[PDB]
Design a protein around this ligand. Structure first.
Ligand SMILES: [Zn+2]
Lengths: 287, 50, 69, 286
């Protein structure tokens, strides 16, 4: 229909609430509401996420208890920030994350309250480490198919939408759905203290403790895996000396003949762990 | 009470049939390997309260 | 992905306690046959390297038969 | 008792956003909230958390507020959505703990039998490990103190979960120098010396400070006790502690001969492959 620039802001707590609540109830689509602030025409800013309670034991079925609305928003009024609801979410846990018939069913009833209340889909399965996968959508009408649907200001967002993407059925659901870009702004305070946590708190408390424990390893436990290393670096070696012989025998470097390889580099890296933690001994133990 | 029992039926019309199978063995803490009785094998997961 | 070895041998290998609880002296007077089954099955299970030195080529599979009972 | 508590990133970000909640009133307000978790084992688990109303004024500074009813209905909400999840304790912002930081636990001991607290820092000037956690026990003294009811720290870290791995490890995208091996530990090797130094600097500052102020604070029990513990274990003796160094030679031995033998051979073999494919494509190219 009449479109605008497509842009969705986040909160950093949001994504975590999404993944936790969509993981803890995984095989059934778990309803959840979404809370934020309509700043303007084209950007929407979710700032808070609270999950919905569950009901009877069936896929995709959803409800909005209004006493839960009143009491939850009341608690968030006596919490420091009360703000306006901005939409909702659930998961499509086993697939390529398209809104189902029940999803568009609650969308045509939910769209009469808010215009740009954006439906969002988290998936805790098709993301491993380098995917969110954040996936939000927006419903189109059927009355305005006499008119066009195609102003699409700031053209980059659409061409960006077609790349994160697959299916025959998403391709069948470019009707009734046009997505919207999601991006991420991060507090440098929060970024730096998450860096504190996950580049400092993977090192452990007082920080001497586990390195002196490695120093405990280096004179009691290492010699056993050094015996394992020496037995490997005899047994693997007397047959990997057959390998340049057979390289001279068969061809100049053709296809893979069979199972084994050199594999020594990994065992040598474990020996490098041995020497570095043996270097730790002088440093820690003395002074 | 007709409306009550038939509304229970009305809510109940949305349940989904579920596949019956047997578990071959356990791979990991979350990965499970089953066999559908009609046919092929699979690799599945559990719920969180099982 | 690769799987670890799996896919039941009807359960697997009886695993703890599914022993028939039959002893040696329970069988009476089958000395040639018990001794032959021993040397065909139980003995190559342990003294594997004697076969490689004497040059016997111990068998792969053994077959029993007889009237029912 | 408790082995250690396992804090997840979600609750720490749930403190940071809470400071963002109450950062607009500004005037005089610490961050205080309520902790949620799971008593897993002797180890402790933490999953969720949320807010609480709380304030504290200047005159007669023992004025403190814990809404029971907020706790009742919002714990009813969280128990309604998740029955695996229940209360384990509370938290606050923790610059340090002040004197009024016992009464919160002494309120909500009637909710959790061992109501554990969490002390964080929203300002990451701490070059130590955040998310400190205490627990209140009693240590009734030889001097005949009636009941000393003192919080005591049980160690803490940041744990892992499969989905929060996806979350955190995508939210960083910032720094990765590790290439995990001989050098993923050396940054923390600078850290262990430097963060023994910071703690020892706190030690010498405390030792100099007890003589000046506190009127005669000096710790009176755990100064001489743990000081003599310090003065009973710096072993610098020289009879066979010298003779650990042919085991050090043995530590050198294995890695020296593994490196010297196999590294050169592998790099040589790769030189063989490179020069074969170099000259045999050179005679076909030129
Ligand atoms: Zn759905």
């Amino acid at each position: 229909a009449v479109d605008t620039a497509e842009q969705v802001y986040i909160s950093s707590l949001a994504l975590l609430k999404m993944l936790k609540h969509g993981r803890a109830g995984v095989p059934m689509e778990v309803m959840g509401l979404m809370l934020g602030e309509f700043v303007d025409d084209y950007t929407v800013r979710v700032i808070d996420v609270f999950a919905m309670p569950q009901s009877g034991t069936g896929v995709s079925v959803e409800a909005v208890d209004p006493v839960f609305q009143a009491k939850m928003l009341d608690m968030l009024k006596q919490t420091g920030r009360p703000e306006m609801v901005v939409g909702w979410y659930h998961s499509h846990p086993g697939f390529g994350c398209w809104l189902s018939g029940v999803d568009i069913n609650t969308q045509q009833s939910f769209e009469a309250l808010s215009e740009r209340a954006v439906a969002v889909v988290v998936d805790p399965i098709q993301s491993v480490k380098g995917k969110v996968v954040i996936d939000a959508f927006r419903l189109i009408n059927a009355n305005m198919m006499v008119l066009g649907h195609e102003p699409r200001q700031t053209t980059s967002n659409l061409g960006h939408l077609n790349k994160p993407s697959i299916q025959a059925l998403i391709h069948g659901l470019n009707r009734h759905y046009y997505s919207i870009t999601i991006n991420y702004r991060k507090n440098e305070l929060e970024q730096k203290m998450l860096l504190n946590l996950h580049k400092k708190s993977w090192m452990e408390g007082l920080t001497l403790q586990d390195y002196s424990e490695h120093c405990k390893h280096n004179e009691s436990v290492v010699k056993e895996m050094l015996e394992l290393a020496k037995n490997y670096n005899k047994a693997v070696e007397e047959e990997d000396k057959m390998t340049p012989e057979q390289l001279a025998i068969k061809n100049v470097g053709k296809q893979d003949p069979k199972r084994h390889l050199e594999e020594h580099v990994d065992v040598l890296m474990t020996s490098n762990i041995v020497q570095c933690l043996a270097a730790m001994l002088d440093t820690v133990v003395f002074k | 009470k007709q409306y009550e029992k038939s509304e229970n039926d009305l809510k109940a019309l949305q349940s989904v049939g579920q596949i019956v199978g047997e578990v071959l063995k356990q791979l990991t803490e979350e990965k499970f390997i089953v066999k559908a009785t009609n046919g092929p094998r699979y690799v599945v997961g559990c719920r969180r309260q099982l | 992905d690769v799987l670890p070895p799996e896919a039941d041998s009807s359960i697997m290998m009886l695993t703890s306690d599914q022993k028939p609880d039959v002893m040696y002296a329970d069988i009476g007077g089958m000395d040639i046959q018990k001794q032959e089954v021993r040397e065909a099955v139980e003995l190559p299970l342990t003294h594997f390297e004697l076969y490689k030195q004497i040059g016997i080529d111990p068998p792969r599979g053994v077959l029993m038969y007889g009237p029912p009972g | 008792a408790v082995q250690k508590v396992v804090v997840h990133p979600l609750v720490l970000l749930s403190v940071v956003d809470h400071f963002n909640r109450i950062g607009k009133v500004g005037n005089q307000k610490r961050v205080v909230g309520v902790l949620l978790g799971s008593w897993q084992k002797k180890v402790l688990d933490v999953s969720n958390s949320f807010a609480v109303p709380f304030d504290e004024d200047d005159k007669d500074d023992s004025v403190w507020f814990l809404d029971h009813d907020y706790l009742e209905n919002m714990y009813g909400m969280f128990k309604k959505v998740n029955a695996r999840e229940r209360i384990v304790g509370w938290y606050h912002t923790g610059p340090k703990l002040h004197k009024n930081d016992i009464a919160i636990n002494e309120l909500m001991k009637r909710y959790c039998p061992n109501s554990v607290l969490v002390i964080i820092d929203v300002k990451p000037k701490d070059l130590g490990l955040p998310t400190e956690a205490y627990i209140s026990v009693e240590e009734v003294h030889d001097d005949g103190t009636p009941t000393s009811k003192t919080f005591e720290h049980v160690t803490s870290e940041i744990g892992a979960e499969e989905a929060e791995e996806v979350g955190v490890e995508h939210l960083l995208r910032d720094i990765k120098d590790t290439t995990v091996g001989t050098l993923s530990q050396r940054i923390t090797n600078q850290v262990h010396g430097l963060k023994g130094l910071n703690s020892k600097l706190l030690d010498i500052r405390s030792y100099l400070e007890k003589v000046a102020t506190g009127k005669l604070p000096i710790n009176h029990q755990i100064i001489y006790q743990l000081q003599d513990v310090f003065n009973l274990l710096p072993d610098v003796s020289l009879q066979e502690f010298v003779k650990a160094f042919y085991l050090k030679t043995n530590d050198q031995m294995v890695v020296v001969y593994l490196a010297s033998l196999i590294r050169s051979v592998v790099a040589l073999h790769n030189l063989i492959n490179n020069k074969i494919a170099n000259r045999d494509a050179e005679k076909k190219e030129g």
